[PDB]
Structures are given as C-alpha cells and as structure tokens.
Design a binder for this molecule. Structure first.
Ligand SMILES: [Cl-]
Ligand SMILES: [Cl-]
Length: 196
C-alpha cells in the first residue's frame, strides 16, 4: 500500500577493489526509518546491514571488498508499516584478477553498418566473460559469453551494425561462476572506428 523505495550507488555500482562507494535508499518524503539488506550466497536468510551504519538511508563503504558484493535491497517505514523491498541493486567489485585482452576481427576500423567480431582472451581460464559498451548516448550494455564446463580462456562476441555518430568503446571482464559479482580488472578500452 506504500510505494517501494529505490536504491542506488554512488559513484557507480561497479567499483575497483579498495575504492569507496555509497548506497542510497530513498522512499517517500514521510519515511521515518530505513533498513538495508544484502542477499546471502547459498543461504536462505539475508544479511541485515547494521543500523548503526545506515544514516538517512545511506550506507557508506570506505573501501569495497569482495564481501560487500551482491544484491542489496532496502525498505522504509511509514504509516505504521514497512514497505516491500526495493528493486535489487547489484554491487560489483572489479580488479580481483588480471585483466583479459580484447581484440577485433577483421579490424577495429569497420565500415558503417558493418558487423565485427570481438575476442576476449586470458592466460588463465575464467568461468565467463562479459563485453561492455559505454557511449555518450546510452547506458552500459554488457553481452555475456556462454559459460563452459571447465571455464574458458577465450570468448567471441558479435557486435554492430556500428554507426559513425555513436561512440563504440568496449571493455571486457572475466569472472568466476561461484562469485559472479567479483570481476577482473577491465581489459584495455577497444574503440571501434568508422571511416566516413
Ligand atoms: Cl577484496
Ligand atoms: Cl564464445
């Protein structure tokens, strides 16, 4: 009967090991109190974040560690009841593993409208890879490789129709299936360019 709050992370929900992040819950203007939770990996109960650590629905993490990663949700209290939990915020830590290599075939320079193959490679196998694109006009879109039986050290993605106007800068990350919110250092940025 009371609208569920939202939950966000500042500056981002993808944060390098040791760096700070703040999670913010915001409910109705008449919220009297907030609670924050994180979902347990392989336990049916969830973790209450200690109330001494949530001030005005804010939970500040001075240096993120692997133990902070996972799904968070929050509620607030108003009109004698607690709200349902927010939509989950997934907090991710990067930099736990050496970065993979990212390359384009046939070329990082691609005619407008053409498609291209990107390859993410690693010296040691990962459970899976993700290829993320960020541009001036859109949110991060990550393609996911299909996880394989005993992990893999190479993944192949197809990207584009590339267009001139957009910016097509990609990075790729490796992760292990049993802790999927702990990622490698990102690969070097690979920018696809269109001659025109
Ligand atoms: Cl850590
Ligand atoms: Cl693949």
């Amino acid at each position: 009967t009371i609208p569920k709050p939202t939950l966000w992370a500042e500056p981002d929900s993808v944060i390098t090991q040791g760096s700070p992040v703040t999670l913010s819950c915001q409910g109705s203007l008449e919220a009297q109190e907030y609670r924050l939770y994180r979902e347990k990996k392989s336990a049916s109960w969830i973790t209450r974040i200690r109330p001494e650590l949530v001030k005005n629905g804010q939970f500040h993490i001075p240096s993120i560690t692997w133990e902070h990663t996972g799904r968070y949700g929050c509620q607030y209290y108003s009109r004698a009841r607690w709200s349902e939990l927010s939509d989950p915020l997934v907090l991710v830590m990067t930099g736990a593993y050496p970065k993979p290599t990212l390359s384009a075939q046939p070329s990082p320079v691609v005619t407008s409208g053409g498609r291209v193959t990107l390859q993410c490679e690693s010296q040691v196998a990962f459970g899976g890879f993700i290829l993320c694109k960020e541009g001036e006009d859109e949110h991060p879109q990550c393609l996911n490789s299909q996880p394989h039986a005993r992990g893999s050290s190479r993944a192949i993605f197809s990207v584009g129709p590339v267009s001139p106007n957009r910016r097509w800068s990609h990075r790729c990350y490796g992760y292990d299936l049993n802790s999927p919110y702990v990622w490698s250092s990102p690969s070097d940025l690979l920018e696809l360019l269109v001659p025109g």
